[PDB]
Amino acid sequence: FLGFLGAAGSTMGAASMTLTVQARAQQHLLKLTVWGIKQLQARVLAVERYLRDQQLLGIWGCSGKLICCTNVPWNSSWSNRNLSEIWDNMTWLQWDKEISNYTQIIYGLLEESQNQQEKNEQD
Amino acid sequence: FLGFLGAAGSTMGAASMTLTVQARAQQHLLKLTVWGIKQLQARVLAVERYLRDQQLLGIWGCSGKLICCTNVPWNSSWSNRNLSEIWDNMTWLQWDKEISNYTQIIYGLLEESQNQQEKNEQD
Amino acid sequence: GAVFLGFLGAAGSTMGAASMTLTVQARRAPEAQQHLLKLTVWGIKQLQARVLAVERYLRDQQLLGIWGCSGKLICCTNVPWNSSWSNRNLSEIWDNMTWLQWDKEISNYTQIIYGLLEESQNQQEKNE
Amino acid sequence: KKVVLGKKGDTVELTCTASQKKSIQFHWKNSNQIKILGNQGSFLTKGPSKLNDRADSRRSLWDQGNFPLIIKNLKIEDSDTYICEVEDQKEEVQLLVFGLTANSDTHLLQGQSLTLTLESPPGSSPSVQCRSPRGKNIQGGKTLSVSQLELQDSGTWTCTVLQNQKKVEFKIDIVV
Amino acid sequence: KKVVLGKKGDTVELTCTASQKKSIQFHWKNSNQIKILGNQGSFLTKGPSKLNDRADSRRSLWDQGNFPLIIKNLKIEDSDTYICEVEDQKEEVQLLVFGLTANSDTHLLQGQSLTLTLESPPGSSPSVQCRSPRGKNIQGGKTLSVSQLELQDSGTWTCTVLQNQKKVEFKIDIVV
Amino acid sequence: LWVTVYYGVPVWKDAETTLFCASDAKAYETEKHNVWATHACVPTDPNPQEIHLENVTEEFNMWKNNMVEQMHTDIISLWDQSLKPCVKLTPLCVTLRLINCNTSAITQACPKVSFEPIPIHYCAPAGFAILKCKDKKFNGTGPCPSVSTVQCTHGIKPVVSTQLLLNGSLAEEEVMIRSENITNNAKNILVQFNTPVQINCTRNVSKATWNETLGKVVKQLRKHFGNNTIIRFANSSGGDLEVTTHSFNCGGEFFYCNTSGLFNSTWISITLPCRIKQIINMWQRIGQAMYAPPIQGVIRCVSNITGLILTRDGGSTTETFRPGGGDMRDNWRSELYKYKVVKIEPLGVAPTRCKRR
Amino acid sequence: LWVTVYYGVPVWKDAETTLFCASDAKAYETEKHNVWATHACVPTDPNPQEIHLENVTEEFNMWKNNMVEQMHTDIISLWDQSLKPCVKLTPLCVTLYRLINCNTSAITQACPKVSFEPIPIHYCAPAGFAILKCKDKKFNGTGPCPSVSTVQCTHGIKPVVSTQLLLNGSLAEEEVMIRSENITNNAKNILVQFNTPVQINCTRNVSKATWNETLGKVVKQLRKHFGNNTIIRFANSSGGDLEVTTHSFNCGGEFFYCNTSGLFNSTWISITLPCRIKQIINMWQRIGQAMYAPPIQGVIRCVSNITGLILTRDGGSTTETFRPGGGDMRDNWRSELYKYKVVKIEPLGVAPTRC
Amino acid sequence: TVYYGVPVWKDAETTLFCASDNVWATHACVPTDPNPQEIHLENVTEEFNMWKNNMVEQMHTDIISLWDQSLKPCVKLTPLCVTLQCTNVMRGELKNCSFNMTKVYSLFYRLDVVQINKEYRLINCNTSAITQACPKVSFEPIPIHYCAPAGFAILKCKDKKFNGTGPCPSVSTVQCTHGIKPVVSTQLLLNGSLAEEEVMIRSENITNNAKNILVQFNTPVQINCTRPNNNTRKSIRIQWFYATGDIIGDIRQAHCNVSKATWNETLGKVVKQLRKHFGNNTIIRFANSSGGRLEVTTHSFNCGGEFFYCNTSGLFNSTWISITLPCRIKQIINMWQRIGQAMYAPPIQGVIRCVSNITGLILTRDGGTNSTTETFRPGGGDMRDNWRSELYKYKVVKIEPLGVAPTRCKRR
Ligand SMILES: *[C@@H]1O[C@H](CO)[C@@H](O[C@@H]2O[C@H](CO)[C@@H](O[C@@H]3O[C@H](CO)[C@@H](O)[C@H](O[C@H]4O[C@H](CO)[C@@H](O)[C@H](O)[C@@H]4O)[C@@H]3O)[C@H](O)[C@H]2NC(C)=O)[C@H](O)[C@H]1NC(C)=O
Ligand SMILES: *[C@@H]1O[C@H](CO)[C@@H](O[C@@H]2O[C@H](CO)[C@@H](O[C@@H]3O[C@H](CO)[C@@H](O)[C@H](O[C@H]4O[C@H](CO)[C@@H](O)[C@H](O)[C@@H]4O)[C@@H]3O)[C@H](O)[C@H]2NC(C)=O)[C@H](O)[C@H]1NC(C)=O
Ligand SMILES: *[C@@H]1O[C@H](CO)[C@@H](O[C@@H]2O[C@H](CO)[C@@H](O[C@@H]3O[C@H](CO[C@H]4O[C@H](CO)[C@@H](O)[C@H](O)[C@@H]4O)[C@@H](O)[C@H](O)[C@@H]3O)[C@H](O)[C@H]2NC(C)=O)[C@H](O)[C@H]1NC(C)=O
Ligand SMILES: *[C@@H]1O[C@H](CO)[C@@H](O)[C@H](O)[C@H]1NC(C)=O
Ligand SMILES: *[C@@H]1O[C@H](CO)[C@@H](O)[C@H](O)[C@H]1NC(C)=O
Ligand SMILES: *[C@@H]1O[C@H](CO)[C@@H](O)[C@H](O)[C@H]1NC(C)=O
């Protein structure tokens, strides 16, 4: 999980190109049992968090795809700039700031995207 | 991350929405290590069960998705009744009894329909 | 946790038997010698095996989603089927060739095979 | 309607088989639906009847799927139907028990009449032909009266109970 | 601005208020922004003032949200405003002290004038309303000339000196 | 009319699973029950996270349970390993319908050791959970209005007793009487008392406490019946001596207490004549056991009477219920009634509301 | 413009959750420090992974950092486990201004002589989180760091309790540094980090002319913040409880408090410090007092290096005087971990690829 | 197109861990798992070469690592090596030694101590610091299972004719290996695992003289050797150092008893199989130990922590056409043929009785005597083969279920 932010501070295009491929006596006894329990609890928490993120991405229809396009258009009524300016001038780190005021719309579109995909499959 | 349990006996349709965003000192050490391992087994077993479920949904042709629709008919012999009333005054727990004797059958037919669909798409 | 399996019969015969097998797959501590802590240790070993199994499955699934499969046991690609590498008859390599020795014959160049598969998925990407 | 006849004082065997071989709960009910005997776990409980000391069961065969009921020191009133319900079936068994004995203890001489007593059970159609091997193939009902007492008038042969093509054997006490 | 009044040597309990009840770092400052008393974790420190040997705080009350300041043996030159800095407040409290004494403890006759001494704090505006048990509410300056000595002149007085509607009971040494 | 497949829905299913025991074994006692608990039982849960479920209707069947049979086998293992029969006679008794058949005698280590029944909780393994319906008006079959999921059952004492359940659980509202099928006899009666009935056994039952409980049970029976044909307690039916007598073990000695006097009341302090026998028949399996003579030390045993077992009689007036027992499965049924193992299955099947091809 | 989802974009947001301790506890030591470490920590990873980041600027605030609160609570628990006071008073004073006697509860506990030896400790964020580390040596405590680097486990911190002098860890990398929330405000503490440690030996004594040189470096750094006038002065400690007035610390044996007048008596334009072991203390963990057993007869010698200073300037009315008075232990733990911040990974996004 | 979920194994290398049931011979290893799972594999022929196999290489690594870990814990005897004034006291060959500590008397054998310049000293104490053998620890062999960590499987070949190489008819997957007896033995194997009724000979290259020949008998043969020695033990300060004590009674060379009939019959089976390997017409002979470094010439073994060197050259020499046996003991040590420190094992008080079963034997074929006589002199000294013999059937594997195979598919 901390590997991803290695790409931060780079132009969003190069960041996404990189995103296309990321990972492609009692002394011993106590070491084995309690230390192992906690160390392994950490790994289980890691896999559970990753599975939660994967599930959330799955509800939107893009299961197991790092990059994908959903048929809902971008909400343009609120202020937004042109695509070429977006992908080049900025980088992903401050791109969270541009949508932080959209956080409610974020929570909208994050659910809205899945609502569109399920309405297309149901219709 | 698991979503094992959920809403109680209620209109199964409303519960249909609820799942979508529902979840996605030490005196003696020997008591902790033999009991913590059991709860850790429970968590990893739930994770493996979720992975198996997603795998089965995938071989049915819809992996990741939570509300999967594909072409497969509702056979009349499967305790046919008015759909509306099952939606209003029926819950998942009570409805599990009415479809238990047909569960393997519908699994098999959905499976061969998925096989036919992928064969037709390929050829 | 699908990494656990032992059936290896389809190797000599048609691979399709393995295809049926994978589809089927898809669907106390006496304390006399302090056996309590011993059972905890063995349970730790087994549960570690399970968590490493699921981690390995996800590691393979990330790579399989790099190509256009992402969890499908039976994937499909547009790369040429041999004709440049192990140009043996399809019948013998699907019905006579043992799975393990077949996989060695492939691992001669399996890395470039994966590379061409990734290129295939890349071409499928943004096809539009 | 399987039926057995005892000696009215002997030990008779009644068995109901369970093909499941599990040693499970069973009881015994009479024609009035009164418990007489059964198991509770791995024990033996006798139902509140008038035959508590008189009847019992063979515990050893319960594990192998045989659950019997054995009555000792039989008598006339013991003749009634019984039922097994080992899992759910009501396997019925008919019991008609009665004996035939003598009453003329010592007042017998050359030519005097001897008397026999037969316990006629209510609700039956028997025909007693209790005989002897020495030559007394006599036919009679309750009383066995013979004008002359020769050597061919004593002994005990196969007693013909004759209840629906079933035959048993018991003793007749007469000696010469 | 809360104002408290002293008796030239008594104890004064200035109070802050912890709106959080968490005992978080605070500091007691004076008008010249010189530290007097301060919290450091769970200890207690004193800054470089004229009250280092005099300042004190009831330590036990901090955990409940009370941060008192105690100045025993108060002197007039120490009359200055004090400020808490509990979390972000600049709660300003003022302390005023002036001592009523008599230069002639015993040199007095029947009808001889009497001289009182009020060591007032410089830069202050006291209102000396000496509420004397003779019925003479004397409105005067630093000294009060008593032109007559009667037998009723005994008893401790209460020269309630008001300053911006701030009153407090007073026990001055007038004994006969 | 095309079915789809929803996921994550709440669906439960009855299943049979092996269960693991969680007993609070001190492990530093010479008594064999505790060392067995260390031998095959895990310690108890540090903190039980019982999750209440509302608006849940769950068909509870206390007689079609699995914990009762699992703990039956486990407690047989307990009694064989701990209270070892130092003369044990068992009929191997091979078949060949009549067949003569043999008995084998086995000798063992034979120490006179006190039996202290510490509670033995039962916990379902990973992936399954036990369900308890907390309604105080459970009648043994049907829906339980309130149901809560838990991982470990309440602590049970593996008591062994006949005609009187000892050290058992207490009913909350009424002294409940439960039978699988009450309309006809040959089915046991299971009673749960609100208040424990103290007893004293030495080598007496307090009156005015047992009498009021009998009044409560006859009130409950007349509630179940038509207020007529008054139930009166009577003698033991007869048969094997263990079932006819109040048989129980504490301190390693088998005490058989005649209970006819207490079941001698007709409804519209008392001392018990207890005895000790060297020859027993094990509840675990068919056979007979011989044990060592009792220790000279006076054995004082005080145990609450919590449950009572009866049997009905067929009739052509007043009801007479005979003391029953010997079926230890029914005994631990009375304590583990409100429990049911279940497995969760998120996958489900859907209505026709879709058209996608 | 069509919204498309990306998984794994390098996006983080600042947020606190519970961190987990990591210590290479030997677990075969009877000292209660290793006992606590092995009870409630995990072994350090043999291969810590630190990926450097380029062209990234993050705003660090050590003063408002909240991981320090977690470490302070954890060490409070550690001290409750390790040093068991066999006379303990804790004010209750239930309130319905000295309304009641507020009588101190008088818990009495076991009084064993257990060695208390500090051991290195690491804090690692739970999975799904990152611990940023500012590598810039010019970091003045608050504001942006031009260069940052991510590592799951911070550098080994020795949890060491001490007033008036930090010691046993956290050496400065390049230059002596001065940090403060508000250097103008007198109340806020001033943390000073030493580039070179000065060895201090205390026995049942500090190296001179190395203390002098470090002090000169400190006054230079202070003048850098000030106007090069108002000559810095050190003097008698301010006054108050013994723990703050004099250098208080413990090393295996009983804690002791040492006069530091010789240490701070210079005005900038071998040193022996009288130290007294006391059994009567004011607990730093919570308000109250404690009494301990008399110290062991065996000679106890402690070797340490004074890597840090805590100074508070006098009130303004000229010249500036600094006195050592750091008692709030949160300050000591802010000094060691001034450059670490907990942050949460949020690897999702939205972009206009036009399908 | 890819076929996920397919069973494939690539022979790999992984660090297996202990499974044991103060003494360093039984150190804190993991307890042996309670229900070792075993799954048979039908129709699976797995290639093997336990000479070159990855399991044997990595097992050498694991064995060497564990022996290194297991040697250190005992305390050392670094400075005690000094000049010693000793006088000699079936020649006994025992020297009583005095060293000036303020003089102390101790007992050393002739072979452990050589002349220096009467004046006597240890062979290599100056060159290599000598290590004392801890009295608490005892040198005892126990069955040690080997377990593969998670993600690795252990393959076991259950074939009687296996010979350790080539295809194996029946194979199985096992979590933990069967108990391995770590036993020190040269030109011979003690208390090892019983072999198949037919006798196996294994060699990396049958023609090569350099490659050793290892033979496993079908039936164990009794090898019990006794040393009737009544020794004592002394507390001589260096810190209380603990050394050899005075002797009561008469010393005897440890005599070992072997049944001549069963030994002859086992080697008769052996020469039958050797005729199979080298030609029945060829006449096969046996000879005594070849020679070389004293340790490798003689059979070296340990009982009760005491090492006896059976240089019973008559036993290995069995001249053919195709009883009690004396032995010495040693107190100075070169174990695993290490050039480093030499630990020192002082004697244990009381008679030493060692009972064991002969389970194997190692020879080295003479260079070719071509088809006329095939002398097979006992060869050994490499401790690799002893553990190598016990686990010929085991290998490590990893699973890579990512098969790719060419099938027709168009899709989109
Ligand atoms: C039901 O619960 C009750 C508790 O409510 C429980 O009763 C307990 O039984 C045990 C077993 O006898 C009692 O333990 C006894 O304690 C005394 C005093 O400590 C011991 O001396 C006894 O052991 C000795 O007994 C002999 C003397 O007669 C000695 O000769 C012999 O060597 C033993 O050392 C014995 O252990 C315990 O006190 C009671 N608790 C009470 C009455 O509250 C009962 O067992 C449970 N089960 C049943 C079926 O009743
Ligand atoms: C900072 O780090 C230094 C690193 O050196 C550390 O110094 C240690 O302090 C202790 C206590 O002052 C020193 O004292 C003794 O060292 C010996 C040998 O290691 C130990 O055996 C001692 O432990 C026992 O001592 C008593 C002897 O009678 C026993 O009664 C008692 O119960 C103890 O078990 C004790 O540790 C130690 O030598 C140094 N150095 C090292 C390397 O430990 C210092 O404590 C740290 N903290 C501070 C605030 O300076
Ligand atoms: C469990 O609960 C059940 C409630 O549903 C109890 O029901 C019992 O069911 C049996 C049915 O076998 C009843 O027995 C009678 O069956 C006859 C059958 O008709 C003819 O058969 C007999 C000969 O076999 C003959 O004698 C009859 O006269 C008839 O000619 C019916 O006709 C009767 O009406 C009656 O149904 C039982 O009577 C009935 N129980 C009660 C109390 O009514 C069942 O008893 C319960 N079981 C237990 C173990 O508790
Ligand atoms: C228990 O109550 C249910 C509720 O409908 C009923 O069906 C059942 O017969 C009752 N059982 C008994 C034994 O009363
Ligand atoms: C400073 O003290 C520490 C003990 O905490 C020690 O490890 C280190 O070597 C000393 N010197 C330096 C330069 O850090
Ligand atoms: C050395 O020890 C042996 C055995 O105790 C003894 O026989 C011999 O006399 C000793 N040597 C000397 C010189 O005392």
Task: Tell me the three state secondary structure of residue F294.
Answer: coil
Q: Which of residues 103-122 of B touch H (CB under 8 A)?
A: 121-122
Distance CA F78, CA D37 (A): 30
Give the domain D98-176 fold: Immunoglobulin-like (2.60.40)
Distance CA H282, CA H274 (A): 10
Q: Looking at CA atoms only, how far is residue F236 from chain D in angstroms?
A: 9
E36-E37-E41 Cα angle (round to 5): 145
User: Residue D23: left (phi > 0), alpha (psi -120 to 50), or beta?
Assistant: left
Sheet with G275-277, side-by-side order of all strands = G247-249, G256-258, G275-277
Question: Does some domain include residue G94?
Answer: no
User: Are F248 and F326 contacting, i.e. CB atoms less than 8 angstroms apart?
Assistant: no
Distance CA F193, CA F205 (A): 15
At C110, give phi and psi (nearest 5°).
Answer: -60, -30
Does the CB atom of residue G164 touch ligand 5 within 6 A? no
The CA-atom distances, in angstroms, between F289 and each of F85, F281, G129 are 6, 6, 66
Sheet with D55-56, side-by-side order of all strands = D11-17, D66-72, D55-56
**Cβ count within 10 A of residue F40:** 18
Does the CB atom of residue G160 touch ligand 2 within 6 A? yes
User: Residue B41: left (phi > 0), alpha (psi -120 to 50), or beta?
Assistant: alpha
Task: Tell me the three state secondary structure of residue G170.
Answer: coil
Give the domain E2-97 fold: Immunoglobulin-like (2.60.40)
Question: Does some domain include residue C3?
Answer: no
List the alpha helices (DSSP H) in chain G. 32-39, 67-82, 211-225, 242-245, 329-336
Residues in chain D: 176
Q: Do H157 and H268 fall into the same domain?
A: no
Does the CB atom of residue G252 touch ligand 2 within 6 A? yes
Question: Does some domain include residue F99?
Answer: no
User: Can you give the CATH number for the domain in which H256 is found?
Assistant: 2.170.40.20
* Extended strands (E) in H231-370: 231-237, 240-247, 255-257, 284-285, 299-303, 306-310, 324-325, 328-330, 342-344, 352-365
Question: Does some domain include residue G103?
Answer: no
Q: Do H332 and H372 fall into the same domain?
A: yes
* Extended strands (E) in H112-227: 113-115, 119-122, 130-132, 144-147, 153-157, 171-174, 189-190, 200-202, 213-216, 221-227
Task: Tell me the three state secondary structure of residue F202.
Answer: coil
Structure tokens at F272: 């018990």
Q: Looking at CA atoms only, how far is residue H28 from chain A in angstroms?
A: 5
Residues 6+ apart with CB under 8 A from C62: A23, A24
CB-neighbour burial class of residue G297 (10 A; exposed 0-12, middle 13-18, buried 19+): exposed
DSSP type of residue A6 = G
The residue segments making up the domain with residue C47 are: 8-128
| Option in G6, G53, G128 nearest A19 (CB) | G6
At G277, give phi and psi (nearest 5°).
Answer: -80, 130
Q: With beta carbons under 8 A apart, name residues in chain F contacting A122.
A: 353-354, 356
Question: Does some domain include residue C1?
Answer: no
- Closest-approach residue (CA) in chain B for A119: B67
Resolution in A: 4.0
Residues 6+ apart with CB under 8 A from H56: H50, H388, H391
Structure tokens at D15: 């068995």
Q: Which residues pair with H270 in a beta bridge?
A: none
Q: Do H217 and H196 fall into the same domain?
A: yes
Q: Do F168 and F271 fall into the same domain?
A: yes
Sign for the CA dihedral angle at H330, H331, H337, H339 comes to negative
How many CA atoms, within 13 angstroms, populate the side-chain half-sphere of residue B120?
8
Buried b / exposed e along C84-101 (16+ C-beta atoms within 10 A):
ebbeeeeeebbeebbbbe
At C48, give phi and psi (nearest 5°).
Answer: -60, -40
Q: What are the percentages of helix, strand and coil residues in chain H, rounded to 5?
A: 15, 35, 50
The residue segments making up the domain with residue G209 are: 161-329
Q: Do G193 and G153 fall into the same domain?
A: no
- Closest-approach residue (CA) in chain B for H5: B55
Residues 6+ apart with CB under 8 A from E145: E113, E114, E115
Q: Which of residues 12-31 of C touch H (CB under 8 A)?
A: 12, 15, 18-19, 22, 25, 28
- Closest-approach residue (CA) in chain G for E62: G287
Q: Do F40 and C29 touch (CB under 8 A)?
A: yes
Structure tokens at C117: 């598969």
Q: With beta carbons under 8 A apart, name residues in chain A contacting C48.
A: 36, 40
DSSP C36-102: HHHHHHHHHHHHHHHHHHHHHHHHHHHHHHHTT-TT-SB----S--SSSSS---HHHHHHTS-HHHH
Amino acid at G301: R
Domain D3-95 in CATH 2.60.40.10? The answer is yes
Whole-number Å distance, alpha carbon G303 to ligand 5 midpoint, is 9
Question: Does some domain include residue F102?
Answer: no
Q: Do F344 and F328 fall into the same domain?
A: no
Question: How was this entry determined?
Answer: cryo-EM
Q: Which residues pair with E118 in a beta bridge?
A: E100
Task: Tell me the three state secondary structure of residue H211.
Answer: coil
CB-neighbour burial class of residue E110 (10 A; exposed 0-12, middle 13-18, buried 19+): exposed
Domain boundary, last residue among H124, H157, H191: H124
Q: Do C117 and H404 touch (CB under 8 A)?
A: yes
Task: Tell me the three state secondary structure of residue B40.
Answer: helix
Q: Looking at CA atoms only, how far is residue H54 from chain C in angstroms?
A: 17
Instruction: Tally the domains of chain C.
Output: 1
Q: With beta carbons under 8 A apart, name residues in chain F contacting C29.
A: 39-40, 42
Does the CB atom of residue F315 touch ligand 4 within 6 A? no
Q: Looking at CA atoms only, how far is residue H305 from chain C in angstroms?
A: 26
Domain ranges (residues) in chain D: 3-95, 98-176
Q: Which residues pair with G275 in a beta bridge?
A: G258
Whole-number Å distance, alpha carbon F134 to ligand 4 midpoint, is 17
Q: Which residues pair with F150 in a beta bridge?
A: F130
Q: Do C71 and B54 touch (CB under 8 A)?
A: yes
Question: Does some domain include residue C65?
Answer: yes
User: Are F259 and F236 contacting, i.e. CB atoms less than 8 angstroms apart?
Assistant: yes
Please name which of G285, G257, G243, G294 lies closest in space to residue G111, comparing C-alpha atoms.
G294
Structure tokens at G22: 């990591």
Instruction: Tally the domains of chain H.
Output: 3
Question: Does some domain include residue H242?
Answer: no
Please name which of G142, G189, G185, G194 lies closest in space to residue G166, comparing C-alpha atoms.
G194
Nearest ligand to the C-alpha atom of residue D31? 3
Nearest ligand to the C-alpha atom of residue G172? 5
Distance CA H108, CA H95 (A): 6
Q: With beta carbons under 8 A apart, name residues in chain B contacting A47.
A: 47
At G110, give phi and psi (nearest 5°).
Answer: -65, 155
DSSP type of residue F2 = B
Task: Tell me the three state secondary structure of residue F23.
Answer: strand
**Cβ count within 10 A of residue G2:** 15
DSSP type of residue C104 = H
Q: Do H318 and H378 fall into the same domain?
A: yes
Terminal Cα distance for chain E, rounded: 40
**Cβ count within 10 A of residue G45:** 13
Residues in chain F: 357
Ligand 3 binding pocket, CB closer than 6 Å: F 181, 183-184, 186-187
Q: Do G202 and G281 fall into the same domain?
A: yes
Nearest ligand to the C-alpha atom of residue G165? 2
Distance CA C54, CA H50 (A): 32
Q: Do C6 and H399 touch (CB under 8 A)?
A: no
If one residue of G199, G305, G306 were mutated to test the ligand 5 pocket, choosing by the most ligand atoms within 8 A of its CB, it would be G305
Q: With beta carbons under 8 A apart, name residues in chain C contacting H407.
A: 81, 90, 94
Residues 6+ apart with CB under 8 A from E10: E72, E74
Please name which of G350, B56, B115, A62 lies closest in space to residue C65, comparing C-alpha atoms.
A62
Sign for the CA dihedral angle at E102, E106, E107, E112 comes to positive
Distance CA F173, CA H178 (A): 61
Q: Do F22 and F120 fall into the same domain?
A: yes
Q: With beta carbons under 8 A apart, name residues in chain H contacting B123.
A: 410
